Design a protein around this ligand. Structure first.
Ligand SMILES: Nc1ncnc2c1ncn2[C@@H]1O[C@H](COP(=O)(O)OP(=O)(O)O)[C@@H](O)[C@H]1O
Ligand SMILES: Nc1ncnc2c1ncn2[C@@H]1O[C@H](COP(=O)(O)OP(=O)(O)O)[C@@H](O)[C@H]1O
Ligand SMILES: Nc1ncnc2c1ncn2[C@@H]1O[C@H](COP(=O)(O)OP(=O)(O)O)[C@@H](O)[C@H]1O
Lengths: 548, 558
């Protein structure tokens, strides 16, 4: 170590290495593949920021405190100046230029030295496999799984020395324990006070919304950002608050994910109070009746459903133009937090019995493998989605079991190679076979009497083996005539964007709602030509004088 | 020490930097990173030319001024000097020595000299690595978006130790507002006289037109260049353009993006009434079927006629080749001059489920270098929801999520669908008739075996005529006029007879081919039957080229 003597264990005896806790389940491998006779070079494999400092860089802090195995006793973990003394000339060629000046001393150390990571996918490595081929070079490495799998293929100058330490992220609870012995380094630097419910908000609340940093990475900087917002709050040029809270954490978490505090700082039971009120921000209503299917997802938190099944299993029977599109998205707006959780698939594609392998997947060798399926690849894309199966009844009169493995054993296998998991889904089936009769009255006090003629008539294309695996046959509440006047004004919003741009007032007194009461609630045809009760008598002659 | 570096706060102890207005939240973000214990280095990421320098310029006038928090008092922020590194080399490898002596002495400062590295994408810079956590170096970055992914985010070493302060395209009013208090050095330097609206018509009229540039960089590059065409008469020997005007800012904008001055002097309702009488010179007719084709632009780009709809797929009757699919080849004249808009689909007899896997590697070769364009689709007539399932949300919503996923800015690009089924059950003959055959077949021409809800969802139920009987050598006059003034020099002129003009102008009508029997019934006179007496030895002038009364093949004797 003639040029320099950069020592990791000296940084442990001075305390410049950060105080480390936990992570002893995977020091019991790092050492077991380190103090061996052969294969003496561990590589910590995971996501970038999992705890590669938490294992390797605390081992030097573990040497001087004596809880390391014997054989490792009297071993100093060293490092190089790799990052400033890889080079020494002006032009290119400095990838491994002055490596030989500082690798020759390591042979003389006689089984004591351990060289650091130094980002060993960047050492590529013109001199490393010359240096490592004898095995006397005693090291630790660490590289992420994108830079461990893509990096090397069959190097027996590398995999001869490396052991597959696939390091993993801790759970929700574990990273909370890390911040208890890490708040002793933030009581001196930011000069703040950190409390115990303040450190739980960094872990368990960012667990559902934040995934770009692993569990003891995102929970540490979320703590230290509020601790770096303290003197931004105290000393913005009366407001001295060095005691941090969970509100400081939930502040900077709301500014990071994109979603505000409004759907974040509550328990799931606390947004459950206005769940129907956020349902009926866009649902046509009938809140005295249709809260049964509201209770079914409310029954999905305790866990008395089948664990070998998805979250939901239903039937969504009724007319069209009623909530076939409206009710399904609003189930995804609350739990699944999205407007693109929609897998609308009309099952009129089953005019051939060969079309089982098109929504699911062709076999290997047959055409339809390079793109996969429809009810699989979207669920491969979105495993956190509701699933909506439009018009089930047009399945083949001989061929089914397209929807039985998804409900019985919960899982489904496409023709690609990997089984698709449906455990975080809810099935929504619209097999309209006998409920296309909205023209009858049937809806003054009860709305199930429309359904009672269907269960005697729907079962010739259904089977007894299928209706068992769906619990609540939830009938579509109808679209009344007065109920159009709540949900028809959300189409007008582009002209609502237009009317404030021109300084004019064309706001009505009973002149434009009589044609908005002619969309839906149909006796003969439907809402597809009923949408044209507006364009041919208002939009042509009244607002063509607005661009002139 | 004393002279090896340039302390920008030593320029800010007197006040030789730039103030910050409106960007105060991203400068409270800079201290919000640097106050940390772990990973306490900021990076001022912006677009090309947003003021990534300006934040440290704003940070410099807060340290001595005391508007920073109480922990940055005394810590004076420097900058990475480039000229104090490579000046006066003597032998080979003069980089690492007069970088380290500038570097190593900052160990005992204890966070005092906080370095700023402008152009972190350049700073190479690979000796500043191993001592971030030493306290011997404390850096501040300034990078562009793509220029950060190549240098820090590709690796895991610097991935921790630098945080990204994203700086955006500011508002137009705050763009002028920082130049509203810093206007003194703009009055006597650009050779411009003081007026209010001089910045205005280059900032409000160039955030969308030249949106491929950056307005905070066009916060100088449109003041320095619109007042550079002004500089022809500012000192050359009221009377002339001494003050800035803002019509010549609009006039020089036409010399940048190609959108000329004939749009920037007309009114608003005439600006959208120029496409109407446009495709009438080359493609003749269509005196209403171009008035009511961009009518939905007055009804969807503004938004009038119930935008929860497709555009329309009723009849557009046409002749085979010369006004069926040609009406997107003559559209190189409208808004962005995009000839690479070629997405046209025949969607006529597609009944099998195996014709979709070609549209879903050239997607990032033609549309992403120039995003604001025209995008076409025509002849979408008879398909099933096996292929219409993608194309059911392409009727609206703008942004494409099939395999695209990103912002597909089709509200500022165009989405068009038409169906131009003019093949059977009614046709032209040659190109001259009246207007008594406009709209007569609803379930007969396009909607042969498909639902009427696909033919009542059309806004612009418009068409041109099934003209006929006299004119296919005149709509395709390209092989009559242009090919027979071919020898316009050497004293030559090719005159055609009435046999090839009015005799056969009606006879060999076939409703399938059209353009090739024009070149098959008149395939016997063009060059070498013309060259029976014209070419190869008889090039003497003094005679007139003519054709005579013969049968359908003529030897053109002179
Ligand atoms: N168990 C732990 N004890 C102390 N600090 C930890 C622990 N786990 C993680 N950290 C902190 O999180 C960071 C982990 O760094 P690391 O995971 O090695 O990043 P990378 O994988 O990008 O090299 C370090 O700053 C470290 O201080
Ligand atoms: N509840 C609603 N809110 C807004 N628009 C609606 C609603 N119901 C129907 N529409 C409009 O009516 C048109 C035709 O609806 P339709 O396809 O018949 O509905 P569904 O698929 O539910 O039967 C759609 O383009 C849509 O814009
Ligand atoms: N919003 C703004 N208002 C006024 N001036 C600005 C603004 N943004 C940038 N500038 C000017 O641009 C300069 C910043 O240069 P910049 O484009 O950030 O350089 P670089 O791209 O090399 O980092 C400042 O000196 C300032 O004068």
């Amino acid at each position: 170590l003639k040029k320099y003597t950069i020592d990791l264990t000296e940084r442990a005896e001075q305390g410049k290495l950060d105080p480390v806790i936990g992570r002893d389940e995977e020091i019991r491998r790092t050492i077991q593949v380190l103090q061996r006779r052969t294969k003496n070079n561990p590589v910590l494999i995971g996501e970038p920021g999992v705890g590669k400092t938490a294992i390797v860089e605390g081992l030097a802090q573990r040497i001087i405190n004596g809880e390391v195995p014997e054989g490792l006793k009297g071993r100093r973990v060293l490092a190089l100046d790799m990052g400033a003394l890889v080079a020494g000339a002006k032009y290119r060629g400095e990838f491994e230029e002055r490596l030989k000046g500082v690798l020759n001393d390591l042979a003389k150390q006689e089984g004591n030295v351990i060289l650091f990571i130094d980002e060993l996918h960047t050492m590529a490595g013109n001199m490393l496999k010359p240096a490592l081929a004898r095995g006397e070079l005693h090291c630790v490495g660490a590289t992420t799984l994108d830079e461990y799998r893509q990096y090397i293929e069959k190097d027996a100058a590398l995999e001869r020395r490396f052991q597959k330490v696939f390091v993993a992220e801790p759970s929700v609870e574990d990273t909370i324990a890390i911040l208890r012995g890490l708040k002793e380094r933030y009581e001196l630097h930011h000069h703040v006070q950190i409390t115990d419910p303040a450190i739980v908000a960094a872990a368990t609340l960012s667990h559902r919304y934040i995934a770009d940093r692993q569990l003891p990475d995102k929970a540490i900087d979320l703590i230290d950002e509020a601790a770096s917002s303290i003197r931004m709050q105290i000393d913005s040029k009366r407001l001295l608050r060095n005691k941090v809270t969970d509100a400081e954490i939930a502040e900077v978490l709301a500014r990071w994910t994109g979603i505000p505090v409004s759907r974040m700082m509550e328990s799931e039971r606390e947004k459950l109070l206005r769940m129907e009120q956020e349902l009926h921000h866009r649902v046509i209503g009938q809140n005295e009746a249709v809260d049964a299917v509201s209770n079914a997802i409310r029954r999905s938190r305790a866990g008395l459903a089948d664990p070998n099944r998805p979250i939901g299993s239903f039937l969504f029977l009724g007319p069209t133009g009623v909530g076939k599109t409206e009710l399904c998205k609003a189930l995804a707006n609350f739990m699944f937090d999205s407007d693109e959780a929609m897998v609308r698939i009309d099952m009129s594609e089953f005019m051939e019995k060969h079309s089982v392998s098109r929504l699911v997947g062709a076999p290997p060798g047959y055409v339809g493998y390079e793109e996969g399926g429809y009810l699989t690849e979207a669920v491969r894309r979105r495993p956190y989605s509701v699933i909506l199966l439009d018009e089930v009844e047009k399945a083949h009169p001989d061929v089914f079991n397209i929807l039985l493995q998804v409900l019985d054993d919960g899982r489904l296998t496409d023709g690609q190679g990997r089984t698709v998991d449906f455990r975080n889904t809810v099935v929504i089936m619209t097999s309209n076979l006998g409920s296309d009769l909205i023209q009858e009255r049937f809806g003054e006090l009860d709305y199930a009497h429309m359904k009672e003629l269907v269960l005697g008539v729907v079962s010739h294309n259904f089977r007894p083996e299928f209706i068992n695996r769906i619990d609540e046959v939830v009938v579509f509440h109808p679209l009344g005539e007065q109920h159009i006047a709540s949900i028809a004004q959300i189409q007008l919003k582009r002209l609502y964007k237009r009317l404030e741009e021109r300084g004019y007032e064309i706001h009505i007194s009973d002149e434009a709602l009589k044609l908005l009461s002619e969309n839906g609630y149909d006796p003969v045809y439907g809402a597809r030509p009923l949408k044209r009760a507006i364009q041919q008598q208002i939009e042509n002659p009244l607002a063509q004088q607005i661009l002139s």
